[PDB]
Every structure is written in C-alpha cells, then in structure tokens.
Design an enzyme around this catalytic site. Structure first.
Site, mmCIF file in Angstrom:
data_model
loop_
_atom_site.group_PDB
_atom_site.id
_atom_site.type_symbol
_atom_site.label_atom_id
_atom_site.label_comp_id
_atom_site.label_asym_id
_atom_site.label_seq_id
_atom_site.Cartn_x
_atom_site.Cartn_y
_atom_site.Cartn_z
ATOM 1 N N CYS A 178 0.834 -1.212 0.000
ATOM 2 C CA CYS A 178 0.000 0.000 0.000
ATOM 3 C C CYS A 178 0.865 1.258 0.000
ATOM 4 C CB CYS A 178 -0.869 0.003 1.263
ATOM 5 S SG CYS A 178 -1.886 1.467 1.448
ATOM 6 N N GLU A 213 -4.428 -8.047 -0.624
ATOM 7 C CA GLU A 213 -3.646 -7.878 -1.848
ATOM 8 C C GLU A 213 -4.334 -8.687 -2.968
ATOM 9 O OE1 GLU A 213 -1.552 -10.092 -3.780
ATOM 10 O OE2 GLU A 213 -1.080 -8.413 -5.118
ATOM 11 N N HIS A 214 -4.331 -8.133 -4.180
ATOM 12 C CA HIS A 214 -5.117 -8.684 -5.267
ATOM 13 C C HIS A 214 -4.403 -8.511 -6.603
ATOM 14 C CE1 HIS A 214 -6.147 -4.598 -6.482
ATOM 15 N NE2 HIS A 214 -6.436 -4.342 -5.214
ATOM 16 N N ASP A 215 -4.879 -9.228 -7.618
ATOM 17 C CA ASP A 215 -4.266 -9.114 -8.939
ATOM 18 C C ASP A 215 -4.614 -7.768 -9.606
ATOM 19 O OD1 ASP A 215 -3.134 -11.664 -8.532
ATOM 20 O OD2 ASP A 215 -4.892 -12.656 -9.394
ATOM 21 N N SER A 223 -3.094 -4.845 -9.949
ATOM 22 C CA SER A 223 -2.790 -3.588 -9.227
ATOM 23 C C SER A 223 -2.366 -2.511 -10.212
ATOM 24 C CB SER A 223 -1.692 -3.802 -8.179
ATOM 25 O OG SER A 223 -2.159 -4.606 -7.102
HETATM 26 C C1 HEM Z 1 -5.632 0.435 7.461
HETATM 27 C C2 HEM Z 1 -5.829 1.005 6.265
HETATM 28 C C3 HEM Z 1 -5.338 0.376 4.947
HETATM 29 C C4 HEM Z 1 -4.906 -0.881 4.704
HETATM 30 C C5 HEM Z 1 -4.780 -2.065 5.679
HETATM 31 C C6 HEM Z 1 -4.574 -0.970 3.290
HETATM 32 C C7 HEM Z 1 -4.099 -2.100 2.648
HETATM 33 C C8 HEM Z 1 -3.794 -2.197 1.305
HETATM 34 C C9 HEM Z 1 -3.396 -3.398 0.586
HETATM 35 C C10 HEM Z 1 -3.248 -4.791 1.234
HETATM 36 C C11 HEM Z 1 -3.189 -3.061 -0.703
HETATM 37 C C12 HEM Z 1 -2.768 -3.973 -1.884
HETATM 38 C C13 HEM Z 1 -3.930 -4.193 -2.878
HETATM 39 C C14 HEM Z 1 -3.319 -4.458 -4.237
HETATM 40 O O1 HEM Z 1 -3.044 -3.481 -4.972
HETATM 41 O O2 HEM Z 1 -3.078 -5.641 -4.575
HETATM 42 C C15 HEM Z 1 -3.456 -1.638 -0.825
HETATM 43 C C16 HEM Z 1 -3.383 -0.929 -2.012
HETATM 44 C C17 HEM Z 1 -3.688 0.399 -2.171
HETATM 45 N N1 HEM Z 1 -3.935 1.323 -1.158
HETATM 46 FE FE1 HEM Z 1 -4.105 0.866 0.869
HETATM 47 N N2 HEM Z 1 -4.824 0.263 2.726
HETATM 48 C C18 HEM Z 1 -5.288 1.120 3.695
HETATM 49 C C19 HEM Z 1 -5.658 2.443 3.511
HETATM 50 C C20 HEM Z 1 -5.493 3.199 2.366
HETATM 51 C C21 HEM Z 1 -5.889 4.579 2.183
HETATM 52 C C22 HEM Z 1 -6.609 5.431 3.255
HETATM 53 C C23 HEM Z 1 -5.531 4.965 0.936
HETATM 54 C C24 HEM Z 1 -5.728 6.340 0.253
HETATM 55 C C25 HEM Z 1 -6.608 7.265 0.666
HETATM 56 C C26 HEM Z 1 -4.897 3.820 0.300
HETATM 57 C C27 HEM Z 1 -4.434 3.757 -0.988
HETATM 58 C C28 HEM Z 1 -4.186 2.589 -1.690
HETATM 59 C C29 HEM Z 1 -4.104 2.507 -3.142
HETATM 60 C C30 HEM Z 1 -4.325 3.641 -4.154
HETATM 61 C C31 HEM Z 1 -3.770 1.066 -3.458
HETATM 62 C C32 HEM Z 1 -3.607 0.440 -4.862
HETATM 63 C C33 HEM Z 1 -2.123 0.370 -5.220
HETATM 64 C C34 HEM Z 1 -1.985 -0.275 -6.572
HETATM 65 O O3 HEM Z 1 -2.991 -0.820 -7.103
HETATM 66 O O4 HEM Z 1 -0.853 -0.208 -7.120
HETATM 67 N N3 HEM Z 1 -4.885 2.770 1.187
HETATM 68 N N4 HEM Z 1 -3.825 -1.141 0.420
HETATM 69 MN MN LIG Z 2 -1.656 -6.524 -6.058
#
Ligand code: HEM
Ligand SMILES: [Mn+2]
Ligand SMILES: *[C@@H]1O[C@H](CO)[C@@H](O[C@@H]2O[C@H](CO)[C@@H](O[C@@H]3O[C@H](CO)[C@@H](O)[C@H](O)[C@@H]3O)[C@H](O)[C@H]2NC(C)=O)[C@H](O)[C@H]1NC(C)=O
Ligand SMILES: *[C@H]1O[C@H](CO)[C@@H](O)[C@H](O)[C@@H]1O[C@H]1O[C@H](CO)[C@@H](O)[C@H](O)[C@@H]1O
Ligand SMILES: *[C@@H]1O[C@H](CO)[C@@H](O)[C@H](O)[C@H]1NC(C)=O
Ligand SMILES: *[C@@H]1O[C@H](CO)[C@@H](O)[C@H](O)[C@H]1NC(C)=O
Ligand SMILES: *[C@H]1O[C@H](CO)[C@@H](O)[C@H](O)[C@@H]1O
Ligand SMILES: *[C@H]1O[C@H](CO)[C@@H](O)[C@H](O)[C@@H]1O
Ligand SMILES: *[C@H]1O[C@H](CO)[C@@H](O)[C@H](O)[C@@H]1O
Ligand SMILES: *[C@H]1O[C@H](CO)[C@@H](O)[C@H](O)[C@@H]1O
Ligand SMILES: *[C@H]1O[C@H](CO)[C@@H](O)[C@H](O)[C@@H]1O
Ligand SMILES: *[C@H]1O[C@H](CO)[C@@H](O)[C@H](O)[C@@H]1O
Ligand SMILES: *[C@H]1O[C@H](CO)[C@@H](O)[C@H](O)[C@@H]1O
Ligand SMILES: *[C@H]1O[C@H](CO)[C@@H](O)[C@H](O)[C@@H]1O
Ligand SMILES: *[C@H]1O[C@H](CO)[C@@H](O)[C@H](O)[C@@H]1O
Ligand SMILES: *[C@H]1O[C@H](CO)[C@@H](O)[C@H](O)[C@@H]1O
Ligand SMILES: [Br-]
Ligand SMILES: [Br-]
Ligand SMILES: [Br-]
Ligand SMILES: [Br-]
Ligand SMILES: [Br-]
EC number: 1.11.1.10
Length: 299
Positions: free
Chosen positions: A30, A105-107, A109
């Site tokens: 993330c 986490e997922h495919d 991204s």
């Molecule tokens: C406790 C809070 C959070 C947790 C546990 C978390 C967890 C994760 C995880 C496991 C992924 C990987 C998903 C993937 O792309 O395969 C991810 C991706 C992402 N997260 Fe977080 N997230 C949290 C909060 C946030 C917040 C508040 C934002 C923005 C406001 C954010 C922005 C993003 C974005 C944009 C991705 C996609 C990255 C990509 O596809 O390359 N996340 N998050």
């Molecule tokens: Mn991923």
C-alpha cells in the site's frame, strides 16, 4: 517534513520528516501505509501497529477520516490472523503480511506486479508488494500527455491493468478483484483529486503529478501544492467514486478481459479464510525506496 518547516501548515501542524526504509524495515503493498511509515506516523519499522495508531495517522496526516479505513482495518487484521496462524489482537504484526496474495492484496494492481506475473513455472512467485515503475507506467500511459483524469479515464486504467494481468499471469492464477481495487480507485480520487477546482467534491479529477509523486516516492506531494483534504474525506466519497468509475462508459475495450469486467462491481466486504487453508509464502524482498532521486527529510 521537518516539524519546523511549516510545509504542512495549516492542514497538518505536526509533521515529521521522511526517512527511507532500511533493509530490515517492513513495508506494505500500500502506497498510503508506506508513506505513513516512512514519516513515522505509524512505526518506521512497520511492525506492531494498533488500530488507533492507523486511524490517527490517516486522519491527522492525510485528511482521511476513520470511516474510510473501517473495512480496511477489519481486513488487515483478518489477513494478519490468516498469515500468522493466531489472533493478532490490536497489534498488526507487520505491514509486509498485507501482501498475502488472493486476500487483501489482489491481482491487476495499478503499480505492483502480480504474485505469479510472467513466471515460467507454476510454483514460482515474484514481488507483488514493492512499487514497480514499469507496472505503474502501464497505468500512467493510459492517460499519457494529460495533467488530470476523470472517472471514465480511471475505468480505462483498471481495464488496461486487468487485461495485461490476465494475459501475463501464470495460467489459472489471475483472479479479478473489482470490489477491492475500486475502493482503491476511490482512495486515489479521495487523496489526490484536484481540490483547487471549484467542483472537486462533485466531479473530482486526479492530478497525475500528485498521483505519480505519492506512488513513486511513498511520501506526500507538498512541493506540488498538495495538502491533506480538509475536511477529511469520508467513506461516502470513496464508495461513490468507486461506483462512478465502474459506471463510466467504456470507449476503448482491451482484449483478454475476464468475464463481466465491464459493468458495476459488488460491494467490498470482510474477508474470510478457511482454517484448513495455509497461506501463500510472502515475497521476501527488501522494502522499496525512491532512488532516482533519493528523498530528503522534507520531500
Ligand atoms: C488500514 C488502512 C489500509 C490498509 C490495511 C490498506 C491495505 C492495502 C493493501 C493490502 C493493498 C494492496 C492491494 C493491491 O493493490 O493488490 C493496498 C493498495 C492500495 N492502497 Fe491501501 N490500505 C489502507 C488504507 C489506504 C488509504 C486510506 C488509501 C488512500 C486514501 C490507500 C491507498 C491505496 C491505493 C491507491 C492502493 C492500490 C495500489 C496499486 O494498485 O498499485 N490505502 N492497500
Ligand atoms: Mn496486487
Ligand atoms: C512479516 O510477518 C510475516 C508473518 O509472520 C513474516 O512472514 C513469515 O516469516 C517467517 C520467518 O520469520 C516464515 O517462517 C518460516 O517458514 C518456513 C516455511 O514455512 C519454515 O521452514 C521456517 O522454519 C520458518 O518457520 C514464514 O514462512 C513467513 N510467512 C509467510 C506466510 O510467508 C514476514 O517475514 C514479516 N516481514 C517482515 C519484513 O518483518
Ligand atoms: C527474499 O529473501 C529470501 C531469503 O531471505 C530469498 O529466498 C528470496 O528469493 C527473496 O530474495 C530477494 O530479496 C532479498 C532481500 O531479503 C535479497 O537478498 C535477494 O537478493 C532477493 O532480491
Ligand atoms: C494549525 O494551526 C493554526 C494556527 O493555530 C490553526 O489556525 C489551524 O486550525 C491548525 N490546523 C489544524 C489542522 O489543527
Ligand atoms: C519524488 O520527489 C522528488 C523530491 O521532492 C522530486 O524531485 C521528484 O519529482 C518526485 N518524483 C515524482 C515521480 O513525482
Ligand atoms: C458508496 O457506496 C456505499 C455502499 O457500498 C454507500 O454506503 C455510500 O453512501 C456510497 O454510495
Ligand atoms: C458520490 O460522490 C462522488 C464524490 O463526491 C460524486 O462524484 C458522485 O457523483 C456521487 O455523488
Ligand atoms: C454507484 O454510485 C455511482 C456514483 O453516484 C453511480 O454512478 C452508480 O450508478 C452507482 O449507483
Ligand atoms: C474513450 O473515452 C474515454 C473516457 O472519456 C477515454 O478514457 C478513452 O481513452 C477513449 O478515448
Ligand atoms: C469496447 O467493447 C465492449 C464490448 O465489446 C464495450 O462494452 C465497450 O463499451 C467498448 O466499446
Ligand atoms: C483504448 O484504451 C484501452 C485501455 O486503455 C486500450 O486497451 C486500447 O488498446 C485502446 O488504446
Ligand atoms: C467500490 O465501491 C463500490 C460501491 O460500494 C462498488 O460498487 C465497487 O465494486 C467498489 O468496491
Ligand atoms: C469466514 O468465511 C469462511 C468461508 O469462506 C470461513 O471458512 C471462515 O471460518 C469465516 O467464517
Ligand atoms: C500452504 O501450505 C500447504 C502445505 O502445508 C500447501 O499444501 C498449501 O497449498 C499452501 O501453500
Ligand atoms: C538521498 O541520498 C542521496 C545520496 O545517495 C542524496 O544525494 C540525496 O540528497 C538524498 O538525501
Ligand atoms: Br515481524
Ligand atoms: Br511480465
Ligand atoms: Br516536486
Ligand atoms: Br464484482
Ligand atoms: Br470483497
């Protein structure tokens, strides 16, 4: 940034500097969690993290309200228990376990490779966790030559990512994840849409330079005029944005899309894993940090 710099003022009056993660530090898949950890708003080592620590970090330093991360918190702790084999209570063991594949986490991204992307053999896996410049460039290329993009553009980006991943992943690995990804689509609009435009709340447009800075650097684009949204963004904005992306008309259709790619998505819900199921091994790579250029404390 350095607390005396005033770079965050008057939106964040208590900033801390960027510090690159070291080889033993734990980082997430993330870009938001990684930026928070790089600033020590959650532990710099990325270990032993409570729900309130996360809630306060997002609220006070990113203008993201508690409602936005309610499900994310639930799911982080579900995955922690799944990966470690015991209840994690209110101390998330580390950030790295969040890259457990086919889970949170997922495919497909925006900026990470898939766990079995381009592997020659079925048992093999790769780094699905650290920021990957080439992957991110495939997202950025959909909006090449532009400074801003809208919901329809974001829909095209995620479709391009789904197509590429479905073609490149080891046969049988690829699994579509519209609900979780498109909450993250909403997260991008929530954090880096252009609040300087009069109709931002109703018709948000992502600033591409802000997005690129946040993802590439895993720090905050203050130097480009960004600040934490004020008032803090709430879950309604995020899920509305998510729905708007998936509702947007597709004018360029990639080949090799999975069944039902184009169309509305299910509501994201709590994850669950059977006790019989052993977790996939986590990629062990050292945490990514920006090196072209490396970042200073105020970057
Ligand atoms: C406790 C809070 C959070 C947790 C546990 C978390 C967890 C994760 C995880 C496991 C992924 C990987 C998903 C993937 O792309 O395969 C991810 C991706 C992402 N997260 Fe977080 N997230 C949290 C909060 C946030 C917040 C508040 C934002 C923005 C406001 C954010 C922005 C993003 C974005 C944009 C991705 C996609 C990255 C990509 O596809 O390359 N996340 N998050
Ligand atoms: Mn991923
Ligand atoms: C973040 O936390 C996770 C979860 O604890 C860490 O992943 C786990 O790391 C341990 C090593 O400390 C691995 O245990 C080893 O597993 C092998 C094979 O099962 C076994 O033969 C060894 O005796 C040892 O038990 C465990 O496999 C691994 N879990 C998974 C699902 O990959 C991770 O290392 C932590 N990351 C950071 C940077 O702190
Ligand atoms: C992670 O570390 C494992 C052993 O500690 C290796 O078996 C994995 O292949 C993976 O290696 C990658 O990351 C480590 C950093 O922990 C590097 O030392 C390796 O060169 C590789 O990039
Ligand atoms: C930062 O401090 C200024 C001056 O005291 C104040 O007006 C502003 O509300 C503060 N911002 C926050 C987020 O508390
Ligand atoms: C990363 O941060 C540095 C330092 O502020 C900046 O010069 C660079 O343009 C940033 N990278 C991106 C892709 O925005
Ligand atoms: C986004 O979607 C959720 C349902 O998943 C609503 O609760 C929210 O108001 C927004 O429309
Ligand atoms: C839900 O909210 C989003 C963000 O404010 C809007 O863009 C959308 O049209 C719907 O009202
Ligand atoms: C979810 O919400 C979005 C944003 O209002 C709509 O465009 C979509 O039709 C769905 O109801
Ligand atoms: C059709 O229009 C959409 C949205 O406006 C674009 O994203 C796409 O590239 C095509 O030109
Ligand atoms: C590309 O093609 C698909 C179906 O083949 C459409 O749903 C989409 O709108 C675009 O024209
Ligand atoms: C329209 O846009 C889509 C997604 O970006 C591409 O897959 C297609 O080739 C065309 O450029
Ligand atoms: C973002 O949120 C919307 C509304 O809940 C879903 O339709 C979408 O699949 C994604 O989870
Ligand atoms: C969540 O749901 C799963 C079913 O997929 C169960 O296996 C698990 O124990 C929990 O109830
Ligand atoms: C977890 O580990 C078991 C072996 O204990 C495998 O059978 C399973 O596929 C998963 O990797
Ligand atoms: C990152 O580290 C480099 C040294 O490799 C510096 O040149 C740069 O200013 C930044 O602190
Ligand atoms: Br650990
Ligand atoms: Br590849
Ligand atoms: Br800059
Ligand atoms: Br779906
Ligand atoms: Br889901």
């Amino acid at each position: 940034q350095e607390p005396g710099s005033g770079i965050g003022y008057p939106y964040d009056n208590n900033t801390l500097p960027y510090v690159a993660p070291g080889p033993t530090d734990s980082r997430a898949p993330c870009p938001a969690l990684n930026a928070l950890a790089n600033h020590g708003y959650i532990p710099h080592d990325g270990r032993a993290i409570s729900r309130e620590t996360l809630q306060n970090a997002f609220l006070n330093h990113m203008g993201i309200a508690n409602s936005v991360i309610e499900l994310a918190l639930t799911n982080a702790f579900v995955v922690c228990e799944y990966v470690t084999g015991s209840d994690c209570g209110d101390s998330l063991v580390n950030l790295t376990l969040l890259a457990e594949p086919h889970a949170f986490e997922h495919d497909h991204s925006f900026s990470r490779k898939d766990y079995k992307q381009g592997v020659a053999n079925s048992n093999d896996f790769i780094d699905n966790r650290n920021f990957d410049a080439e992957t991110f460039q495939t997202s950025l290329d959909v909006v090449a030559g532009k400074t801003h993009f809208d919901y329809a553009d974001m829909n095209e980006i995620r479709l391009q990512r789904e197509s590429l991943s479905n073609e490149l992943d080891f046969p049988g690995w690829f699994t579509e994840s519209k609900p979780i990804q498109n909450v993250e689509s909403g997260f991008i609009f929530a954090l880096v849409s252009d609040f300087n435009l009069p109709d931002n709340d109703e018709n948000p447009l992502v600033r591409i330079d802000w997005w690129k800075y946040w993802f590439t650097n895993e720090s905050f684009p203050y130097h480009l005029g960004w600040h934490p949204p004020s008032p803090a963004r709430e879950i309604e904005f995020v899920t509305s944005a998510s729905s708007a992306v998936l509702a947007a008309s597709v004018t360029s259709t990639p080949s090799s899309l999975p069944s039902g790619a184009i169309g509305p998505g299910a509501e994201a819900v709590p994850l669950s894993f059977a006790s019989t199921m052993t977790p996939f091994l986590l990629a062990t790579n050292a945490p990514y940090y920006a090196q072209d250029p490396t970042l200073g404390p105020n970057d």
